[PDB]
């Protein structure tokens, strides 16, 4: 295959990019960075900021996971139909991100102590998701406009991680719960999720979730 | 356009996007948001994120300062040549966003029994972008390819924000020392920079640097 993940044995921060290129139908090669092998230090003194995932399309390197989601945005036509709805999935995608930031540090710095106050601060955090969709097609459609788009997977990953979190967190939001049931039963999205290249991995490398 | 920004009096999240439309010879509008009018809360209800800064573009209004960046950089040109040089751009641009994440947490929140531990970590944190510069025509144009792009704005802001905290972070990278020197004599950015509208606001809003 043309493209190669890099990456821990987790879901993490490249759940979105798999669920893209699988519900996207292209073929890709896992390379799994064990601890050892990090520790290790080659690998991640080679890597551009020290850190995975790295990402090979051909001999095109990167590294920085919304890049390659934006790369693959880009090459696979999941970036809007024009310069307009392209900076509304950046808004989206950029959004996600933020959160994710946020999810990221609850879970590897603060899960004890942070979960209570995180989950209270949840609705308000997610609220702009229901809102965006609530404008675009009733929230019938996708993100942005009407066709899938980079942000679709990224923002599809970020809700379903939340679901875990924080069971019954979209209840509040019935476009959002809606969209995650749609997006999931797309047909090969729907395969690849069943599947154990993602059943077996966690989501994140520290045991919690 | 027409363009404005809405943001609060400081440099922080604003001060690459300005840079860009100074240099690139583009007309905009502050609109400048008082922490009091802010502390009214009508203003950022009604923000996307509920945050600033916000953008319009006509009748286009963004949030995210990044998506503002990206669609400056798609709509006039300053994207790379093609879509390995986009990836590339983006690459650098999600770099340079990380460690404006851990300035800003430094900043905001951990200055004073922070400071010390950033700042010894700094030169492993720029090191990166000496090292593109080094694989991109000896470091003698800009940070991908031969045009300037949205990122170039944003390192430079970043660079210029590290030389404050941290004097003489960049002696040990000449080809960061000379871009900076290069990019900042560019004549309109010249101009900016020394203008009161850059020299007179804080670059934090806490009056940290
Ligand atoms: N802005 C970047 C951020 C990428 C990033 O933060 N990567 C980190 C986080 S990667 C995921 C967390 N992680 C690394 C911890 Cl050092 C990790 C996750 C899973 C495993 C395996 C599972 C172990 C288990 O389940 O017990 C091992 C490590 C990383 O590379 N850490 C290594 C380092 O900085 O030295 C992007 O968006 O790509
Ligand atoms: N991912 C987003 C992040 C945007 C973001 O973090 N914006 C914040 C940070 S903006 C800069 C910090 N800030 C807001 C703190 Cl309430 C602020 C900075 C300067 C001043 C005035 C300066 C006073 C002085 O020292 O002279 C007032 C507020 C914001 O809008 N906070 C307000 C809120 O959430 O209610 C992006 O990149 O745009
Ligand atoms: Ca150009
Ligand atoms: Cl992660
Ligand atoms: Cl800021």
Redesign the interface.
Known sequence: PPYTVVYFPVRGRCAALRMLLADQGQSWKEEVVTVETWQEGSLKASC???QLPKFQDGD?T???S??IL??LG??LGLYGKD??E??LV??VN??VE?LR?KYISLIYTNYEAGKDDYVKALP?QLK?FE??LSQNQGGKTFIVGDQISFADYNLLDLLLIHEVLAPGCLDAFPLLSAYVGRLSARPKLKAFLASPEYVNLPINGNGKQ
Do not use: I
């Open positions: 551009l900021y020290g095109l990167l590294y920085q919304n890049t934006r790369h880009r090459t310069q307009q392209a900076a950046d808004m950029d959004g933020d930031c308000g702009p809102t965006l």
